[PDB]
């Protein structure tokens, strides 16, 4: 799952050639953070 840039939409694209956002036109994608438990030492 990948988040687009100025537009809010999940691309969810894993193809090598698929780098462009759908219905947006911009080619900047941010990787989304899933629900994973991570431990930190305070």
């Amino acid at each position: 799952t990948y988040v687009c840039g100025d537009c809010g939409q999940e691309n969810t694209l894993k193809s090598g050639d698929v780098i462009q956002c759908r219905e947006c036109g911009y080619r900047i994608l941010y990787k989304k953070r899933t629900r994973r438990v991570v431990q930190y030492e305070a």
Binding site: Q20, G25, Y26, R27, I28
Partner: protein, 52 residues
């Protein structure tokens, strides 16, 4: 600056050795930056260029 630079340069007649070829430059215009995407033209911003 650009208009003065282009106006200063003068193109003389071009002869290989009757027919002759001469070229002239008119008013120079510069458009705002844009991105030539495959779908359609899109707004271009400095951070888009930095990331891409």
């Amino acid at each position: 600056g650009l208009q003065n630079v282009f106006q200063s340069f003068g193109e003389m007649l071009v002869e290989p050795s009757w027919r002759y070829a001469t070229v002239k430059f008119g008013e120079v215009t510069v458009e705002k930056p844009t991105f030539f995407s495959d779908d359609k033209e899109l707004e271009f911003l400095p951070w888009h260029a930095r990331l891409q």
